[PDB]
């Protein structure tokens, strides 16, 4: 039979519905949450753009095949261990954001197992100070 398009449909569906969940989640935010989320997009894009080269050199150390999943996290979380400043959080988030952008053929889960749990907890710690740093 004609099967040579089966994997294309699989890939596009997973992308499609994932984008639809995201839209469903954004829709259930109030305007304040939307304005904060908008600020996070723009902040990280600024940092990713102005530190394009710096991130590429950091991305190469993390990209090689040797690292375990915890080893990536422990490298990223090291900055947050001693330095809990909100800007350090924002840079960390922007770097995580850049890694996600380059892993568009890897599994989404592979990216989420870097961010979620420990790392996002440490960013959310004193979230009020983080939000205030971002919203001005």
């Amino acid at each position: 039979a004609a099967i040579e398009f089966d994997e294309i449909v699989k890939k596009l569906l997973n992308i499609y519905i994932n984008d639809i969940c995201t839209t469903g989640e954004k829709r259930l935010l109030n305007n304040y949450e939307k304005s904060i989320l908008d600020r996070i997009y723009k902040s990280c894009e600024y940092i990713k753009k102005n530190y394009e080269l710096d991130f590429n050199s950091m991305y190469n150390q993390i990209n090689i095949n040797d690292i375990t999943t915890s080893d990536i996290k422990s490298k990223i979380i090291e900055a947050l261990l001693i330095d809990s400043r909100p800007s350090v959080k924002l840079a960390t988030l922007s770097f995580i954001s850049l890694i996600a952008e380059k892993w568009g053929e890897k599994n989404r889960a592979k990216i989420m197992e870097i961010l979620s749990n420990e790392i996002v907890e440490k960013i959310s710690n004193n979230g009020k100070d983080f939000i205030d740093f971002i919203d001005r």
Partner: peptide, 18 residues
């Protein structure tokens, strides 16, 4: 702590900016 050493560096430089 090489990646960490740069995240703070970017953090400092952006801290001054905003």
């Amino acid at each position: 702590i090489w990646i960490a050493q740069e995240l703070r560096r970017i953090g400092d430089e952006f801290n001054a900016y905003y």
